[PDB]
Write an enzyme that holds these catalytic residues in place. Sequence first.
Site, short mmCIF file in Angstrom:
data_model
loop_
_atom_site.label_atom_id
_atom_site.label_comp_id
_atom_site.label_asym_id
_atom_site.label_seq_id
_atom_site.Cartn_x
_atom_site.Cartn_y
_atom_site.Cartn_z
CG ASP A 43 -1.93 1.13 1.20
OD1 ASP A 43 -1.98 1.88 0.20
OD2 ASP A 43 -2.68 1.27 2.19
CB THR A 75 -3.29 4.96 -1.05
OG1 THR A 75 -2.66 3.68 -1.03
CG2 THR A 75 -4.47 4.95 -0.09
CB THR A 76 -0.59 2.89 -5.27
OG1 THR A 76 -0.10 2.34 -4.04
CG2 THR A 76 0.55 2.91 -6.29
CG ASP A 95 -6.18 -1.56 1.26
OD1 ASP A 95 -6.52 -0.82 2.20
OD2 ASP A 95 -5.00 -1.63 0.83
#
Lengths: 192, 344, 518, 71, 536, 155, 48
Positions: free
Chosen positions: C57, C90-91, C384
């Site tokens: 993550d 998030t990436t 996630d």
Amino acid sequence: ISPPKPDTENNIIVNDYRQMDKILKEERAYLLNICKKIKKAKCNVLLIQKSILRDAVNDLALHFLSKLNIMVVKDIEREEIEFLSKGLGCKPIADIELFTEDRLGSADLVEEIDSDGSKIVRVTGIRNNNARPTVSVVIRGANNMIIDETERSLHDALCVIRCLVKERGLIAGGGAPEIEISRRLSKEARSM
Amino acid sequence: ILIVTSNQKTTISNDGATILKLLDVVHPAAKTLVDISRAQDAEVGDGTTSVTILAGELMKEAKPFLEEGISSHLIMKGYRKAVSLAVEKINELAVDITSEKLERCARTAMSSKLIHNNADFFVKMCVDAVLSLDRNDLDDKLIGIKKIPGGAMEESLFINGVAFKKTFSYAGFEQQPKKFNNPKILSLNVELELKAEKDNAEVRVEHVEDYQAIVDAEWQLIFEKLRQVEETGANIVLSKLPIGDLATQFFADRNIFCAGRVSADDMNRVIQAVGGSIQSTTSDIKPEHLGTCALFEEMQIGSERYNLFQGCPQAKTCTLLLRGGAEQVIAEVERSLHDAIMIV
Amino acid sequence: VQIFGDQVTEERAENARLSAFVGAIAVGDLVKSTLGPKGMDKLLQSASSNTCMVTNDGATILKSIPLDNPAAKVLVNISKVQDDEVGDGTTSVTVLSAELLREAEKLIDQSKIHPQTIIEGYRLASAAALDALTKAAVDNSHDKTMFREDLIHIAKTTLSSKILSQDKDHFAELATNAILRLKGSTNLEHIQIIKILGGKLSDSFLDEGFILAKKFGNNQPKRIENAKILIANTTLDTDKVKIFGTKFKVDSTAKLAQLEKAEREKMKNKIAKISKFGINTFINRQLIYDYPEQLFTDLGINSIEHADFEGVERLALVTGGEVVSTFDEPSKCKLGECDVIEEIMLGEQPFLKFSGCKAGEACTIVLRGATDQTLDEAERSLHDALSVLSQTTKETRTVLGGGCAEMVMSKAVDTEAQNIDGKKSLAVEAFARALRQLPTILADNAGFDSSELVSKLRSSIYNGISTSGLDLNNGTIADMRQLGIVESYKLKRAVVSSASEAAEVLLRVDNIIRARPR
Amino acid sequence: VVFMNASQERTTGRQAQISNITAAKAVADVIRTCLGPKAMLKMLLDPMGGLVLTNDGHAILREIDVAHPAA
Amino acid sequence: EMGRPFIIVKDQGNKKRQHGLEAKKSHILAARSVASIIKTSLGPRGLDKILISPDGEITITNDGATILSQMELDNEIAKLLVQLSKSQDDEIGDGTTGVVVLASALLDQALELIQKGIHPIKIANGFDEAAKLAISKLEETCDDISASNDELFRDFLLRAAKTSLGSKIVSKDHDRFAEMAVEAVINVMDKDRKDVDFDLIKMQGRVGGSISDSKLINGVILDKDFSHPQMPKCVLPKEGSDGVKLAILTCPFEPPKPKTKHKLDISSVEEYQKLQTYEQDKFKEMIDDVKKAGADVVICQWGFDDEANHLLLQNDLPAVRWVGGQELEHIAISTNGRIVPRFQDLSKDKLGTCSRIYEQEFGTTKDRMLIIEQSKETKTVTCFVRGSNKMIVDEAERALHDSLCVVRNLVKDSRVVYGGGAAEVTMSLAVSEEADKQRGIDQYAFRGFAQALDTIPMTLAENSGLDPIGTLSTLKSKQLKEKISNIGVDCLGYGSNDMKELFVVDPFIGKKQQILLATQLCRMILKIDNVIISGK
Amino acid sequence: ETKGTVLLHNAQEMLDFSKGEEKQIDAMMKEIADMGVECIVAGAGVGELALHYLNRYGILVLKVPSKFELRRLCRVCGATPLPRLGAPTPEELGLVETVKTMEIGGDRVTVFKQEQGEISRTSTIILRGATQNNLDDIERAIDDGVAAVKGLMKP
Amino acid sequence: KTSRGEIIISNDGHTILKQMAILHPVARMLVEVSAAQDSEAGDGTTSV
């Protein structure tokens, strides 16, 4: 076992000088009535867990159980109460009113072995209704490094039987599974 | 002159008294100019720069005399004799001026300092400032001025009474009306909240039944002081000691204003403004001891809300609200106003 | 004349615009290789205690690594918001927002484009990108069968980028059923995750019940059938009453023994009222002493101590009962029901397993791993996946992934670039080329071509086929409906909106002022 | 600046006259015992180590290093 | 020196003294360094700036008041400009970047006059007289819009809103921001359109989501959730009702105890058994007073013990714990309720009334926040802002805060101006015309003040990539040919230099302070001669 | 002097505790006001409850810290201090015709000045000066003249 | 020899890796591998 000390802060006010005589008599009488009920059940061995705040057993109560020939052991870890309950089949007594004979265990011989300057208490025989018996082994050795390794050598031995009882069946060691799997895989690897 | 001390406090002053207070003078003879600057500012307030310039020139003219054969006491004979005839000459310069009955003197005092070009405005407030003080009193606190950072100095206005900062936010403050048609100001030294009463707190209760009456007794005693204020019809209550949210919320339902934390110097101006009196207990409150004014309106000035006291028939209190960009701007204006009032 | 103090770093000139763009390049290049199922994990070296952390993550990587560049802190904050809001991507937000600055760097330097012009170019470009996803969204919530099947395909996409991509087929049903048990609840604090070290990674299972790590105190049997579960939050251990101003006035110790005995009478009277419910099991979140525990022996009631308050809410939802205090009134109080309660052992620590519970509103997930680094990764990988599936129950719109959603948005961006004219056409078309980077990096981590493979996906959409996508397994163009690659619509809008707003931040900074550190 | 690098501070007036008289008196006070037929002797130590023992006035003065300029 | 140490003031060698022309040159260049910083962020084409705090926190803003507040400086002249923009933000709250550029423009024209031999007081005397001539000229050009009804009055509020929303980050949503900023004053205001209370509007930021989720919510937004969350999140009123009967209590739920330290002595078992019944009778009495009053949601300042978790759950009474004292004042204003100090004073008339009480899930975990809505127009309007970045959620607060400062200034009667540089050009030619009539020694003073006002329109052309010479020459030639003062600089390039068709509107009280704060500050700076700065 | 503490057994004694202390100072200060005492000199800190009733009858309040400052005050008016708070003896009361407060050096000073009749002792000399350094030696210069008066007694 | 005054002599592969601190993160994972073998099974933890 001690004079009454509730968790809430208390204030003892002595109004009369003659009241100090009744206080010292009731403090020993409170500890005596606790010991009188123990003799009625013929309990010669008492085990006390480690104490917080006030002490486990007062020095005044030691003379009561000593004249009655009753062995007293204190400063026992709280995590060891579960082992002592199922091991000796004795139901713990948390109140003097709940103390009875049916909640007490039984032992054939209770003796404290003192040898080589070291004292140890061992119980010979267990008589009770128990579906989960216990076991204990004493470990000796030259130093703590050997004794700790002697115990660690037993953990690896106790896990061998645990794997056999949980999963039935076993194979042959000493290099057998490493070479056999390598040979059976080399034949199938060429076909892929 | 711009002077920055070791604490990094910016101050801009042309005043001979203030400049010498910022710097720390370790020279023994140079400290004499500091004493005459603070002595001139204490009484008259003006001329502190002219005194130091004149005192230093008398030493400069005496410098070539010391190099000669003139004795030290012979020089002092010249200054002590000349000052005797100089004081009598000033009396000839002055005029009784009993005819024509503050306007001209206040304009010349603002010279060399800020807002001097604004004298067409601030001087009008300086005239009525000292006139509110009766003869033989002339209190220096009642002319006090509050400084508000931010804003423009031309937005200031004259107020018939003292205005103070709240310094504390009450939970029942907004429920209290901010506009009063005929407010009654009551100054009290009592402390209204739930707390130990006098200097000691201990309670001994043997029985549980009597334990409930002890709590209810504390609520009744605090509310007893609150009921006596409502029965007198006091709209505004001022106190030096803190006031908790218990007494503030009680005054919210009755539409009564409450305040606290006020400094002792500010409430001394309240008694002179509304003509009231100080009552240190709630049992002695009487209707004739309560002051009043024409109106009460709370206006916010520079993110700060103040209580406006104005419209009283006779008020000896004069408080101005000053604005300016720099923190020194608001300081220089009052410094000019404080020096101009001492002239009139 | 220097108005600033000593040790004050400031760049009023080209050095500032260069440091702001290059500062985002090192951040984008760090999480670039972590995008896609073929990506690689990153290693974090702690400055204290020497605790290594391996996570795919991008939110944890950017927050753990210290970054003194303000241009880097902007990309770190948008990653923390993306983790706390949607729970995934998030990436993708950090990479997409960094590529917007890459295309904006060449417009200011080479094309000589005004900074606000690039910002105003993304305003009209993002309007066409968000409207393109609306027409491509399909709502399957009209059928419970099609909606449950879509929850499985979404979990396979999220678990593919993590280490679970091999076993994700077996773990897709575990994450799908766990959200179905919540019955539309978006709170993830109701699901407990117990990490167990050792065994196969595919041995992770989901039991129906509540698995508690705590065990019975002393004499309570391990396995019991038809046991009513009760929960009590408060006191019950050496009651202090309430006020601390209570004391015992004792003239002689004869009366003192009766005062302390009355405290035990209050304990016996309170436990006697609990037995009126007819429960075989009692649970207290506060630890229970030895005296009140022995009172449950003659009553045949189980006792459990030291339960955490966040587990009480998890326990109350599994049993379907009600937290009960003030036992004086039995009528208004409700108790939980359980078919069987058995104490099992997983590894060295024995556990408390529940089975046959009435309410399924909460559950407990048990994981198995070879190392603790894989355990910490397995928990974050499911965190996630369960976050996206939780928001799917609220907003049921879904959009195909795997490079498809990024190229469809770029189709509408090139259309609006013709009507704008001006110099914004270079800024609008820069947003379309920035959307090409996300499917391009997917092929870069797999060792594929970054030009011809992307051109095949772009030319297939302009021919009238909107279902075309990128297949990383075969390295060619495949249909996304058959492969089952789909993501939530909220995740698609969150990545585009967060990157478009974050790109407007650093492009507005002409000057960077650094005060002396403290 | 420092202006004069040599004795920027100055001792003038009666302070300089006392220092000249007091130092000059100390020169004669040590040789007071060196006058007369009963006069004593004075021993001097040079940095070279040679010992000079005499009651002569000149031999005592020239072998003593005086830091006072006027003395 | 004479050979003895001469020290007038302690720390002699530490402090330095500046005088003469070198002291004036250092003061002008100190303002030029601050001006060139602010001139880049002035106008809608400006750019923000990163503010690094010593604690590591960063701030991105173009506001001259916020930039200079966190800016660590050394020279005291640059620190005087810090409180200059602070003076503009505290009172008016608009034009903080314009007061710095205008003040430095007065100092730049004053430096040229000092080199010519003009006394600094003569320079300050010319700026004070020229300041009143510019204000009196612009006051006659503007017109009173108060003759319009409330329907058209809302339009003027939307005009000045969109102007202040520009130049700042997230300026694409200004269309919706302008609508939400005006509706806050429409709901909270006096019936006479005067002296509106700004404190009734609170700014509550939230980090998450997107900017499109920002909407107006009338009520109270608290960070505390419902105690013992076994109750439903969204509370609904009874079928028929007067309201929700919201209850507010500053007293925690406990058995009554004296405020003073007390000692309760129990001398017998009978006295201890009475305390057991006395304990449970109080918790049963406190929960019945709320049920008899019809209240539903109970608000406690200090919270309550876990004993009342199930007690309030049986009666279906929502409750919150650990509510701040400042938030309790915000609650009673929205629901028009009254804080109840104790159960003995609890009545049905002191209970608040709101439309609905509910909580939102927001993101994945985050925290639980309570939201209150109103069923009609009330005195409480809470701003709700969302964003994908912590910096966006921060700057958007002060962005809408300054937008509300412009609307509340329009509440004042008969003050309006048109922006876009049209105000400075109109007031510039009026001062230059008086310089020809006065002549004398002050003729050069009005020229310096006229050239300083033109710097703001020329600064707008720099950020937009225009020619400041060709733009200023067009504005000056337009005011001489026609009397229309509405022609100004257009940084958006939409054409129609008339401000009437572009709707750009600014408050007159905001532009009037820009001249006063700049002129009165330069009057003090030019008087500075000896500069004594102690070493740190 | 030892363990001053408020003891309240029941709520009945608590309700009369607030009004009880108000009647104590009222009863003590009433006997002083009945004697015609317009000024009271205090040697230590006075509580606020005591200062309330002093303002009701218009009685001035004076603080005299330490000792020697208060000792010379009684020599002016010819008064004898007594520690109790009761009604003073009429023979021990002093006589001061006027008490004025005016601004001299910028602060409020209290005027104990006497008049021709009812002469007083230990008079003070107001010394005005521009510098504080001159004020110190002139104070010692006046003491030299005061010490010269002592030389007129013993011989 | 531990950093403290305690000294441990152990042939167990898990105890050796536990009391021996490692500066390489991937090599730190070998300590957790022996813990996975000892917790589930307990025998042959030095072979894995």
